[PDB]
Amino acid sequence: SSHKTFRIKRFLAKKQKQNRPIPQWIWMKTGNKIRYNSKRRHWRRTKLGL
Amino acid sequence: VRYSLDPENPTKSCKSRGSNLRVHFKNTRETAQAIKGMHIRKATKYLKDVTLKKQCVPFRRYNGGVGRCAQAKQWGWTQGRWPKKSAEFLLHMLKNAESNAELKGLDVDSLVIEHIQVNKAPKMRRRTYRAHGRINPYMSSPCHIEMILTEKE
Amino acid sequence: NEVVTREYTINIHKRIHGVGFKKRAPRALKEIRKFAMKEMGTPDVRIDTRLNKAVWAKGIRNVPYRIRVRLSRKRNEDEDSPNKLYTLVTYVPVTTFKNLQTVNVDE
Amino acid sequence: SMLRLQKRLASSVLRCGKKKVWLDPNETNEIANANSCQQIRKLIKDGLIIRKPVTVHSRARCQKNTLARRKGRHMGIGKRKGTANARMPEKVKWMRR
RNA sequence: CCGCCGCAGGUGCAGAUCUUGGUGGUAGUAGCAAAUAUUCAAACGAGAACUUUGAAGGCCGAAGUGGAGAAGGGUUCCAUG
């Protein structure tokens, strides 16, 4: 909710910084396996735990 | 790519193609059979009237539960619909082919569409939500359309 | 020649007889547009916002039985439409529809 | 094209609802590039975005009717729903006496 | 990668409401029918029954489709594409 604990707000803060796509230059590398970010999570799709 | 049929001579023929197009398959095969023996101008005069419900596409094969009309009697058939999106998305392709005619320097209004073929494209999976908490699939049926024009008197 | 302007008293009541209560004032608007194509042979029919108010004067269920219209054909400006000649449909506020012949008016 | 931003701001600048925010339909290009609130206040001074008056709920026939009720009209036996002890009760009558 | 002579076996499939993956007919079929209702003009645009703006006609009718918070959500907020 609006009423958060400091520990939970740092938990959410990590999950937002992990919910960005791959940089466009990453798959121009030599050992190129990654196409897109498979671990991208959406607020309707998956509910983050908690 | 490699087409199904090869034309009589690559000179007098101009190719066009459209892979994985977002129409239905069964509506588009039927409106690509009605086009199959018509002049390049004869086809666009036809399809534009199917877009406006003045001439119709007779559904012959994929006609299960397809209601009737007065216009299908011109084809000697009882059933027929007016597939607006199907007729439109192989009018972009005559626009594409009639351009390739001009690029090859073929006569703009001598071409009769001899070969046209609709193959099924890979289905696009989204789902519907049905009774007693059971998800059944709701797949789209796209198609690969490809056609060869050839000059005639 | 082409820029021709007439008056027309339209019987909506016999163009609208039998349609449901939430599809009359809409249906009325479709037989002022149909009417405008039959007399003045023009696909582009653009019906004025003062006439729309006149049809929706008694709400959706009730339409004025007789309505009077200055039906006017005109040329076009640029940004060329598939058609050139359109028909502006304008309301004529009339007190009595008794003994109105269709007037051939002047521009 | 999209004046959704500039009806919302204009509502909270006028301090009314977006029901009453009248955006000039001929001067659209000037409203479309408002971009801020202070420049929507500029459009009120210029006089494009202007407040609409309150829709008339005139209680004029209401006053007209009560003057009849003060005279005892529309207060007959066939215009009584609640009991005599509900309309004007017996405890309050006793209080007054 | 294979023939011959020996050796070895997780060695031959149509079935098991077999297991996994894929695709058919049904079928362009059932369906997109709860809570009154949308119409006109203009704009942006390749493109309008739906978007935006004005003008209509309506609904919620202060125990509300209104204005806010708790729990839950975790960026869904707001702008620009």
UniProtKB/Swiss-Prot annotation, chain B:
GO MF annotation terms: structural constituent of ribosome
Keywords for the protein's UniProt record, in alphabetical order: Cytoplasm, Ribonucleoprotein, Ribosomal protein
Gene Ontology biological process terms in this record: cytoplasmic translation
GO cellular component entries: cytosolic large ribosomal subunit
Keyword Ribonucleoprotein found: yes
Subcellular compartments: Cytoplasm
Assembly and binders: Component of the large ribosomal subunit.
Known function: Component of the large ribosomal subunit. The ribosome is a large ribonucleoprotein complex responsible for the synthesis of proteins in the cell.
Family listed: Belongs to the universal ribosomal protein uL22 family.
Record's protein name: Large ribosomal subunit protein uL22
Species this chain originates from: Oryctolagus cuniculus
Swiss-Prot record, chain C:
N6-acetyllysine carried by residues: K58
Key words of the record: Acetylation, Cytoplasm, Phosphoprotein, Ribonucleoprotein, Ribosomal protein
Main location: cytoplasm
N6-succinyllysine: residues carrying this PTM: K38, K53, K58
Subcellular location: Cytoplasm
GO biological process, one term: cytoplasmic translation
GO cellular-component term (any): cytosolic large ribosomal subunit
Signal peptide range: none
Record-listed Phosphoserine modification sites: S81
Pfam families, per the entry: Ribosomal_L31e
InterPro entries, sorted: Ribosomal_eL31 (IPR000054), Ribosomal_eL31_CS (IPR020052), Ribosomal_eL31_dom_sf (IPR023621)
Entry's Gene Ontology molecular function annotations: structural constituent of ribosome
PANTHER family, per the entry: 60S RIBOSOMAL PROTEIN L31
Family: Belongs to the eukaryotic ribosomal protein eL31 family.
Subunit structure, interactors included: Component of the large ribosomal subunit.
Purpose: Component of the large ribosomal subunit. The ribosome is a large ribonucleoprotein complex responsible for the synthesis of proteins in the cell.
Name of the featured protein: Large ribosomal subunit protein eL31
Organism lineage: Eukaryota, Metazoa, Chordata, Craniata, Vertebrata
